[PDB]
Amino acid sequence: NVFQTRAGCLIGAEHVNNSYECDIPIGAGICASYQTSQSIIAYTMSLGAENSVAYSNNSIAIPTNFTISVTTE
Amino acid sequence: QKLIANQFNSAIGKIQDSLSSTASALGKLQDVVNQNAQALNTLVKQLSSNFGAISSVLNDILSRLDPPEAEVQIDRLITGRLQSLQTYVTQQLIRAAEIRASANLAATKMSECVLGQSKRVDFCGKGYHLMSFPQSAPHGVVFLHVTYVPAQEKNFTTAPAICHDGKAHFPREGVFVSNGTHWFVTQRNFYEPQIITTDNTFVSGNCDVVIGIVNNTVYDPLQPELDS
Amino acid sequence: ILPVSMTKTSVDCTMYICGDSTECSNLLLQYGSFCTQLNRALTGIAVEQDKNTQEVFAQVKQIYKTPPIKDFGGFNFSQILPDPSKPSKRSFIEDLLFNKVTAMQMAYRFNGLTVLPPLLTDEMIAQYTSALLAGTITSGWTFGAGAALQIPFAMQMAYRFNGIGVTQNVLYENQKLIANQFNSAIGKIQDSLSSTASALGKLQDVVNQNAQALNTLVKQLSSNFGAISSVLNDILSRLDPPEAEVQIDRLITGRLQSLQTYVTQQLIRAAEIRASANLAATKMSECVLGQSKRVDFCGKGYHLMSFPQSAPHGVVFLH
Ligand SMILES: *[C@@H]1O[C@H](CO)[C@@H](O[C@@H]2O[C@H](CO)[C@@H](O)[C@H](O)[C@H]2NC(C)=O)[C@H](O)[C@H]1NC(C)=O
Ligand SMILES: *[C@@H]1O[C@H](CO)[C@@H](O[C@@H]2O[C@H](CO)[C@@H](O)[C@H](O)[C@H]2NC(C)=O)[C@H](O)[C@H]1NC(C)=O
Ligand SMILES: *[C@@H]1O[C@H](CO)[C@@H](O[C@@H]2O[C@H](CO)[C@@H](O)[C@H](O)[C@H]2NC(C)=O)[C@H](O)[C@H]1NC(C)=O
Ligand SMILES: *[C@@H]1O[C@H](CO)[C@@H](O[C@@H]2O[C@H](CO)[C@@H](O)[C@H](O)[C@H]2NC(C)=O)[C@H](O)[C@H]1NC(C)=O
Ligand SMILES: *[C@@H]1O[C@H](CO)[C@@H](O[C@@H]2O[C@H](CO)[C@@H](O)[C@H](O)[C@H]2NC(C)=O)[C@H](O)[C@H]1NC(C)=O
Ligand SMILES: *[C@@H]1O[C@H](CO)[C@@H](O)[C@H](O)[C@H]1NC(C)=O
Ligand SMILES: *[C@@H]1O[C@H](CO)[C@@H](O)[C@H](O)[C@H]1NC(C)=O
Ligand SMILES: *[C@@H]1O[C@H](CO)[C@@H](O)[C@H](O)[C@H]1NC(C)=O
C-alpha cells in the first residue's frame, strides 16, 4: 500500500481514481482526503466539471430569466 | 419588481444560514486574530530560552553570580530577547503591510462598489453587479454583494445584419434573433424580442460587404402612417 | 507579463544549524522555538503561494474545451489554443515561454534548504488557461458572470467595439481587414518572444532571486561568526563540552540569525508577489473575462480582449 506521486513517495494511503475537489493539498496536483473501514486516500485533483460549450457561427444563447444572488465578500 | 422582491428577500434569507451554520465563513478574519494571539503567545514563550546563559530566569543569575560575571551571562539574555522583539516587530510590519493592502481593497470597494456601481467584472463578485451592503465585523468588514446572474437559456439563430433594400440594418443595442420564422431584435442580457423597425436598427453600408447578413423585411413605422 | 507564485521553500532549521551532530543538536533546544517559528513563517508563505496560483488562474467553475471545427471569421487562434501533439498539452506560445525560463540542489537538500513542489502542476495551469481562453473565444465575456453563453465570435468583436465607442458597423465591413491585422499581430509575438531573452526578465528574475537567496544562505555556513572554526564537527573534535558551548553558541546564534534574515527576505519578497498576484487576478477578471474601460490598465490603446498564457511561476497576457 505505497503510492507514487510526482511530489514523492507516499505511504499509507490508497490510490483512488475518482477525482474530487482538493481537500488536503499535497503537491504536483495530488490531493488527499480522509473520506472513503475508513482510511486516507489520495487522488489527482479535479479542476471542476468539464463542460463543452456548443459553438456554431449562426447561433446565440440569450438568457430569458435571471436570479438575484447575494454573495459575501 | 414583485418577482425580484421575492428573489432578493429570499437571497438575504440564505445569508443567515451560511453565516450561522458554517464556522469557516469568517476564516479570513478569525485568522487575522489568530495570527496576533499566535505571535504574542510565542513572544512570551521566548522568555523561557537560555540563549547560552546559564539559566533563563533573569533573577536567578543575579542571585547566583557576581556583577562581573553576570555581565557575561545577562548580555546573552538581552541580546537574545532584544532580538526576539526585533523579530516580532519585523513580523508585524510585514503583517501590517498585508492588512494595509487589504484595507485598500476594502476602501476601494466601499467607494467603487457600495457608493457606486462597479463595471469591473468579478471585482464586486461573480455576475453583473447591482449594489453592495457593508456590514461591520470584528477587525474587518463584510460586504453583501447583490449581483444579477442570468439563469435560463435558449438557443437562438442569429445574424449580424439584415438586407432590406440592400442597405444593411444593424442593431442600435442588442442583436437579431430568430425563433426560426420571424427575426427579432432583443437586448443582450435578457430576452425581450421586439419587432425590427427602422428605429430599432440603423443603416450602414450595403449587403455586398457584411459576412453572414441574412434577408428579411425591416418593418417601417412610417409607411402605415402615410398610408392612412 | 506578471509573476504569480514564487518558489515554495522550506528550511529544516535543526539540520541547517547543527548538521547531523548530537552534541550540537542538544544545544539548539535551549534556543527553543526559534527553529519552530521559522517554519511557521515559511509555511504561511507556501500556503498563499497556492492561493495565488489559485486566485489567478482558476476563476472559472468549469473547464471548457475548444469546439473541434473553427470558423472564427478569419481569426486564426491555432497559435494560442492547445496542441494535442506535445506530450504536455499546451498552446504553441506557452512552449515558447517555457523554453525561455530556466551540483546546486544537491548541496541544498543536504543542508536543509529544500524546494517544495507547487500544488498545481505546470500541466494543470495549462488546462485553466485553455478554459479561460476557450470561454473568451466562444462564450463571449459572460462565462465569468454565470453559465457560459455561446455567441458567434465575429459577433463578439461587434460588441467589444461598442464598448470602445466604435460603432459595430465598422467591424463587419472591415472583418477581413481585421482578420489579417489580427492574425498577423499574433504572428509578431512569436518573434518578440523567441528572439529576445529580456521578454520574461520579470519572471526570470523572480526565479533568480530565490536561487540567489538560497545559494547565499548556503554560503553562510562558511562563516566563523567569531568561533574558532566554521565546521561544527571540528570544534567538537578539537574542544571539550565546556568550551565548545562558548564556541558553538557563537555559530548557532550566527546561523540561526542567518535564517531569520532569509525568512525576513522571503516574507517581504512574498508580499511583493502577493501584490502582483492581485494585479494578475484583477486583470484576469477585469480584462480577460470582461472588457476594461480603464485606460492603460490592459495595455496601451483601447482594449478589446486579452488572452492568458501560462508561464513558469507567472502568467502572460496577450492584450
Ligand atoms: C423566472 O424564474 C423564476 C424563478 O427563478 C420563476 O418564478 C417561479 O415560478 C414558479 C412557477 O413555475 C414558482 O413555483 C416559484 O415560486 C417562482 N419563484 C419566485 C421566486 O417567484 C419565474 O416564473 C420565471 N419567469 C419566467 C418568465 O420564466
Ligand atoms: C416565432 O415567433 C413568432 C412571434 O411570436 C410566431 O408568430 C406568431 O405565432 C402565433 C402563434 O404561435 C400567431 O398567433 C401569430 O399571428 C404569429 N405572428 C405573426 C406576425 O404571424 C411564430 O409562430 C414563432 N415560431 C416558432 C417556430 O416559434
Ligand atoms: C437575399 O436576397 C438577395 C436579393 O434580394 C439575393 O441577391 C441575389 O444574389 C445572387 C448571387 O450573387 C444574384 O445572382 C442575384 O441576382 C441576387 N438577387 C437580386 C434580386 O439581385 C441574395 O442572394 C439573398 N441572400 C442569400 C443568402 O442568398
Ligand atoms: C493558422 O495559421 C497557421 C500558421 O500561421 C497555419 O498552419 C500552417 O499551415 C500551413 C499550410 O497552409 C503549413 O504549411 C504550415 O506548416 C502550418 N504552420 C503551423 C505552425 O502549423 C494554419 O493552417 C492556420 N489555420 C487557419 C484555419 O487559417
Ligand atoms: C487601413 O489600413 C490598412 C493597413 O493598416 C490598409 O490595408 C492595406 O492596404 C494596402 C493597400 O494600399 C495593402 O498593400 C496592405 O496589404 C493592406 N494591409 C492589410 C493588413 O490588409 C487599408 O487599406 C486601410 N484602409 C483605408 C480605408 O485607408
Ligand atoms: C484507474 O483506472 C484504470 C482504468 O480505468 C485502471 O487500470 C487503474 O487500475 C485504476 N487505478 C487504480 C489505482 O485502481
Ligand atoms: C443548444 O444546442 C446545443 C447543441 O449541442 C445543446 O448542447 C444545448 O443543450 C442547446 N441548448 C439548450 C438550452 O438545450
Ligand atoms: C457558418 O458555418 C457554415 C459551415 O458550418 C458555413 O457554411 C456558413 O457560410 C458560415 N456562415 C458564416 C456567416 O460564417
Author numbering:
A (entry chain A): 641 to 676, 689 to 725
B (entry chain A): 920 to 1147
C (entry chain B): 726 to 827, 848 to 1064
From the paper:
Interestingly, structure of the completely closed (state 4) SARS-CoV-2 S trimer without any Fab bound was also observed during 3D classification of the cryo-EM data, albeit in the presence of excessive Fab, suggesting that the binding sites of H014 are exposed through protein “breathing” followed by a stochastic RBD movement. The overall structure of SARS-CoV-2 S trimer resembles those of SARS-CoV and other coronaviruses. Each monomer of the S protein is composed of two functional subunits. The four domains within S1 include N-terminal domain (NTD), RBD and two subdomains (SD1 and SD2) where the latter are positioned adjacent to the S1/S2 cleavage site. Our structures together with previously reported coronavirus S structures, not including human coronavirus HKU1 (20), have observed the breathing of the S1 subunit, that mediates the transition between “close” and “open” conformation.
Cellular entry is achieved by the homotrimeric S mediated virus-receptor engagement through the receptor binding domain (RBD) followed by virus-host membrane fusion. The S1 subunit binds the host cell receptor, while the S2 subunit mediates fusion of the viral membrane with the host cell membrane. Hinge-like movements of the RBD give rise to two distinct conformational states referred to as the “close” and “open”, where close corresponds to the receptor-inaccessible state and open corresponds to the receptor-accessible state, which is supposed to be metastable. We reported a potent therapeutic antibody H014, which can cross-neutralize SARS-CoV-2 and SARS-CoV infections by blocking attachment of the virus to the host cell.
